[PDB]
Amino acid sequence: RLAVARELLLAALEELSQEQLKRFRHKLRDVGPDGRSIPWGRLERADAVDLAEQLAQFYGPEPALEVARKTLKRADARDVAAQLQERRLQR
Amino acid sequence: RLAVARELLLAALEELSQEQLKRFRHKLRDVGPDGRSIPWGRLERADAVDLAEQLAQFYGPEPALEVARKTLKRADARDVAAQLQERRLQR
Amino acid sequence: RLAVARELLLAALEELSQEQLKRFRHKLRDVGPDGRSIPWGRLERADAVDLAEQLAQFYGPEPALEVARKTLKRADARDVAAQLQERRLQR
Amino acid sequence: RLAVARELLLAALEELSQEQLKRFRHKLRDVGPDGRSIPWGRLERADAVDLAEQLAQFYGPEPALEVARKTLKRADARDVAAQLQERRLQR
Amino acid sequence: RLAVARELLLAALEELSQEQLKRFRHKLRDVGPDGRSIPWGRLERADAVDLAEQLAQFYGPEPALEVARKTLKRADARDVAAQLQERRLQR
Amino acid sequence: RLAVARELLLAALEELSQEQLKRFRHKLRDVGPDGRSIPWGRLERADAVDLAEQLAQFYGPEPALEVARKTLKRADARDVAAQLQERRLQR
Amino acid sequence: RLAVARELLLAALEELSQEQLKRFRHKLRDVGPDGRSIPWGRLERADAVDLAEQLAQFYGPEPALEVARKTLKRADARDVAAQLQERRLQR
Amino acid sequence: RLAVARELLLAALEELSQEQLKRFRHKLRDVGPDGRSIPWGRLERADAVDLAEQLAQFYGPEPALEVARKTLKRADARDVAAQLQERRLQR
Amino acid sequence: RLAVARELLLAALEELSQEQLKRFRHKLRDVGPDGRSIPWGRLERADAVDLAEQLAQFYGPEPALEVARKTLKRADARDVAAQLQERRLQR
Amino acid sequence: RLAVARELLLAALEELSQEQLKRFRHKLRDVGPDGRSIPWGRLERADAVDLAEQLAQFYGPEPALEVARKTLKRADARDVAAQLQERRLQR
Amino acid sequence: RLAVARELLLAALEELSQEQLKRFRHKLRDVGPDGRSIPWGRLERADAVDLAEQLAQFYGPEPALEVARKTLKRADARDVAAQLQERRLQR
Amino acid sequence: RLAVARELLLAALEELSQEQLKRFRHKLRDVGPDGRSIPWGRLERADAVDLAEQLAQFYGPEPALEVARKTLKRADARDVAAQLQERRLQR
Amino acid sequence: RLAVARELLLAALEELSQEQLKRFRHKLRDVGPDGRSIPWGRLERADAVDLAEQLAQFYGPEPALEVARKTLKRADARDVAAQLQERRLQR
Amino acid sequence: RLAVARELLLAALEELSQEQLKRFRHKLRDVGPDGRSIPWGRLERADAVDLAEQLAQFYGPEPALEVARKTLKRADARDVAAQLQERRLQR
Amino acid sequence: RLAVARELLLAALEELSQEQLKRFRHKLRDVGPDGRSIPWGRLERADAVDLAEQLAQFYGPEPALEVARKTLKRADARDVAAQLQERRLQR
Amino acid sequence: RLAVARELLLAALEELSQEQLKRFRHKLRDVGPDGRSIPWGRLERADAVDLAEQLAQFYGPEPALEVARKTLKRADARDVAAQLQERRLQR
């Protein structure tokens, strides 16, 4: 459902540390088909809950998990990204 | 019906945040066949309900959804626009 | 009939807002074959019922609907003009 | 009586906030058997007392409560609508 | 009696507002078997008492109530028209 | 006396605000033994002095105070109504 | 006197902060014998002086202090409410 | 009663911290039978008292506690939610 | 002809607004060879048709257009005065 | 003189701010020997010049300064009231 | 003289505003030794000059000033009444 | 000439704003040799053109400019008064 | 034509914001050959449609575009002024 | 006095360190007869002066010292609490 | 010229920040020969364009620059005041 | 003078830091003969210039320095208070 799609993301986004969240927001503006990413103006001072808000709005909450897991492997946090993968199956 | 066509729009217009509504009114004066859009004088100080009024009057309430969903994808709010799409089928 | 021809117009004229009625009276003196329109002296301080009176007298109540619907599309009110169209068939 | 039927309505109409009254007048032109509603021309600039006047005249003061309570649930104000329901029994 | 038949009408005619009286005189020239109505020349500048005079003379004071109540429902004033109905029984 | 009976009323009628006077004229057509009240046609566009005129004529200036104080408590203005009560004793 | 009864209230009403005044207007519509309170329509956008106006009119200025002190204890402002109590004795 | 039903909610809503209130407003738009929740436009910039206002109006103050306690367990605040439960019994 | 000379004037005189007609009657008593103008006594309470009557009688209907167009440019209404000029050629 | 008596008042009345003028009109209906003050009906919607008109008419322009300075000290504006005092000597 | 007695009155009667003249005609039918005043039938639609005519005829022009100044103080216009007093000495 | 003397005044009178015209009519009844000014009864509801009419009649159109420029400096409008001064030389 | 000359102006006048319209009316009284501009009295409280009315009447609708485009560049709105220029060619 | 009661508290509240103030605000929501304490929403981001404000308002400034000294012993700061005790005697 | 005298002022008035404009309006009521300054009632809620309007009217547009530059040095904005000085020479 | 009395205060009020200004507004409502101080409603959200405005109005600008210096010693800012003392002598 739509509600459990946001629940799964926000609980796998504030599992990041304060250091990884400085790296995860940095490692977010590189994905996209061709230049379709989130700009800095709504990312630089984003909190952990606020990041799970506009990531659910720019991509839509159903493929927001796939654009998060592709970057959580790329932000050097393979713990939560693999931990999200078994919990994406329990949707 | 005409009544459920306005009900579906106003509940999918005030689902926008206060920030997206500053961006959605800005991203509205670019659609049209050739220069047929809503001018600034009735858009700049429009509230969320007031925006669902004159958008229903300038285009007509039956294609007002299609000119809203085409811009909600363009105003970087793909959550509510996809959420409107399954509820346009329940008319 | 003549009575339902005026009933259909006056109920589709005071459906206009106070703002559209300032625009609808302005967008009325441009129609005509060649210069046959209603002058300002009997339009500037016309109420909503008073506008449905002399519009029924200058054109006749049977084609007063067609000169109203052609301008209601032109006064940026496509809600009531399309709503009049299905009710012109129920005459 | 007729006097307590208007007293009950006006005290349950200005219990609305200024925001709900912008939504309640908007959510009023959709009821009716088939197209029998109050037009915009006598609703757009209506005050809280003025709204309790012509709502008592268009429907009659005895079923004006039922057309108000059906819309107060629909204007997202279930506080006063349920509060009117126990006071409609004390007529 | 004839005297209480005019008393009941004039007290249910100046119960109309100034706005409804502009609508009630307009909604008067449509009744009739076939084209038997009151012309404009004795209606346009008629006061509230003056309207209760010639409405009592053109139809007769005994069926003047029935041609008034049929139009008071049609002039969007159902308050006084229903209020006249219980007082037509107390003749 | 008759002169101080009208002086006491008019100075306790224009002590009302502009908002209460919209509510006081509305809360006036409900009193009476059985249906003996002032109709709308001489109340809707009545000024503060004009209201103290026909209220003194329909009821008589000696019980016009009692029909005003009974409604000033009912129009949510208990300041002037209690202030009139100590000045009705100084007649 | 009546003048010092309003002076004591308005100087003990704008002693409230901007935060307490958002809480004091909220904590006002619960008092009453049975449902006799001030509605929202004249409270939501009331200033500090405007609140001392209609609180003096709905209750009367002599018991307006008692309905204010009973709520100032209830709006979590016991400073000014106890400070009003020694100044109600100096009337 | 209705008054103690709002008193119990507002004192169990501003017991939330500033951090939980950013999470509680986020965890509010997921409840409902099917899509009947409060939109963002009246939630994003809502204060603690303002949140206890429209939560009492959208659901009604009697089941507003049950839609708050179901989400206070879900917003990771089980202190106040269990503390509300023994105080819902003292109504 | 004489008939189309008055037809052209009256349709270009009630095209003036209510505000310009207060200015046009004021800007009329200044033309003339030497003091040959229309006095106030037959101008101050002149209607739009009545103004097209005595302007056709004091000057004659054939040069009444030239004394009207010289003042319509002077009464700050250059719309109708230029619009009369192409229609004076279609006589 | 009479002319400099009104000049001194109006230039010391619109020296008030917009906030003090809401307080100064409120602090005006308490002066008087016994109940001889200006009622609300000609004070509530009074402008700064309009307030210097009827204050000059109800009291007379020569003691209107003394009833203004006694209230300007009481409306918490001691700047202009002391500034008027040295300019009342330059009459 | 008789001529300067009417000159002094008419120039101190149209110094009244349009609002005071509605109050001054109302405050005129209360003076008299015992019931000797001007009736309504020649006062209700009296202009400012017309009021200075029959006030000079009912009382005589020499004591018409004293019955005007006694009421100009009573119609809440003490400006012109005191201004008449120094000009009654210059007769 | 007489015609350009009124043309210069009316174009320098409606150059005033709506606010200054409320102040300019107020600042007009103070000039004069000794008490020879225009009374209120023909000034209070005077329009901008109507003010240029009776100011040209009470003083005569040739010194009406000097009584206007002396007050336009006194009504705090030194823009148009200095602008009139160079255009009084081009008569 | 004359009709498309007013259509092009009014759609390029309410494209201005509410802020630019406060600047555009201010930047309008400076054009002219020598002192031939529109005065303040018909500009200060002019709406967006009302501004497109008297700008079409003072200059004539055919050169009203050139006096608007010369000022739209001067009112710091070069968007609509350049946008009008390609649409003046499509007349 | 009331002034020295707040002076004694604020000088014995910012004598706390930054560490004790994190512990003192935490050790504040446990006092009370039964559940009458200050909620988190006005305590979590309270400064040292701001804490001496609402502690003086929720309890009243006269027993605010006793609810502070009972908690200063409980927040492991017995230096200032004993130091306040000899200075509560010098009130 | 007069037009470039207002152009130079308004472009050197909205060069002020929002903070300096709160200080510049405050530092304006101290200049003058003896007490000839602009009162608060037309300064407190003045915008940047509105301030360049009445500063051009109270002083006249030709010495309005000198009363602005004398205060721009006094409102702690020496950037624009020196920048105006070289542009006053290019008039 | 009055102008240098406000100049000396505002330059000795914004010499306070942001921290002292939170303490100085708090340490202001304790002075007075007996309860004559400035309430919170016009102090809590007062800026540094705004504080120098109403402190000059409540006390008058000539003793506003003495009520400021008595509190600047009491708000733990003896730098500016002693610095004001040598500059009060240079008035």
Add this chain to the structure above:
Amino acid sequence: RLAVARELLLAALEELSQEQLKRFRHKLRDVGPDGRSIPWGRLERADAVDLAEQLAQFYGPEPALEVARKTLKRADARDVAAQLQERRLQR
């Protein structure tokens, strides 16, 4: 009670050393029925008091002791965990 349940925890949480607190926060995200633990984002920079806050909120203060004692044995601190056990009996 609830108060002694938090008192017992916070005094048995800051009995941990600085080294054990780096190990205790690490040994906290492993308990739970199935994945119901506290995430890193509110644990990594948590102080000793702050840890006793959200541990009391995520679990509730009554079973927060059992989830703390189960981990204090697991964080290699059996001193305080056994010391808490005899003090959990003295509740």
Add this chain to the structure above:
Amino acid sequence: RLAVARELLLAALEELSQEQLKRFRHKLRDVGPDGRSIPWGRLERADAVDLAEQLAQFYGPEPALEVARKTLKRADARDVAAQLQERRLQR
């Protein structure tokens, strides 16, 4: 086109950080041929979308890119300015 000219700018303006946007608005009032730049009054409190509005209006949307790229190199942001350059070619 005009629509893709604004799309390219706003997506290359909110790519700036919050720090660069404080520097970019500062580095904007220096360009121009000679003193033709945007003043502070419409720049100091401009958001990222609001900055892309009036930059498109003061310069026109077609050369607004060139005045933005010349300053983005000058505001020490060469990332987005070079990134805009390859996307200005894809217009």
Add this chain to the structure above:
Amino acid sequence: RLAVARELLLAALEELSQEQLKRFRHKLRDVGPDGRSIPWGRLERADAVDLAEQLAQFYGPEPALEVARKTLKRADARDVAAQLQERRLQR
């Protein structure tokens, strides 16, 4: 020029460290002829760019370099002050 005068300052102001900027703002309020310096209220929370703004406004941008270099030697930063000196010659 004026633009390179601000460019030279801001690039020689954020060359200061974070420690020197705490010392440079402190070492700024001592210069001046006699007491003409920048107060604390606009210096204490000033950023590096914000400091280069009001230092350019209080002194003017042309001698702002000389009041900066005199203090940069005094704030124990002789690196940038000597580095500014060779770049003040390249203006």
Add this chain to the structure above:
Amino acid sequence: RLAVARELLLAALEELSQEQLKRFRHKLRDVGPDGRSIPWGRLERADAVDLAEQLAQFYGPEPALEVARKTLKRADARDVAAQLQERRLQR
């Protein structure tokens, strides 16, 4: 002077080591006539420059040297205290 009085203190305060500054802030809250010292809340996290700020404000900069030298002897730093003594003579 005042400037050299702060210069002498700050250069004799950061001559302290990091260890003595932990002892000097501790040895500061014991001086005073009777309990007049600086509290902890503005001393515990004070830097070396920040300590020379509020020590100059609480005591005044002229006796701040004497309260510093009396404690520098008491904080076991007799080097700088004797070194300040010969430099207090060179003021």
Add this chain to the structure above:
Amino acid sequence: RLAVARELLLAALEELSQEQLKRFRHKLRDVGPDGRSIPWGRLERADAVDLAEQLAQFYGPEPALEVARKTLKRADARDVAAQLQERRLQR
């Protein structure tokens, strides 16, 4: 590409130790054609990721590698600089 140009830099910037990063930020403000380097204000408290941000913005991400490798040889870290060189070829 642009994305792999930043990926290569940030992974070759946090390969530096904590000691070399204190030396690398120091050895960065010496490169440039003539004085075009990054100032201290955005370098002194820059983290390893934050340094890879503004180094990519001041120079552009394509020559940011060349200004990093020229300084990594100069900051006595030839390990990563040679290791970057073979990975700049795999772009």
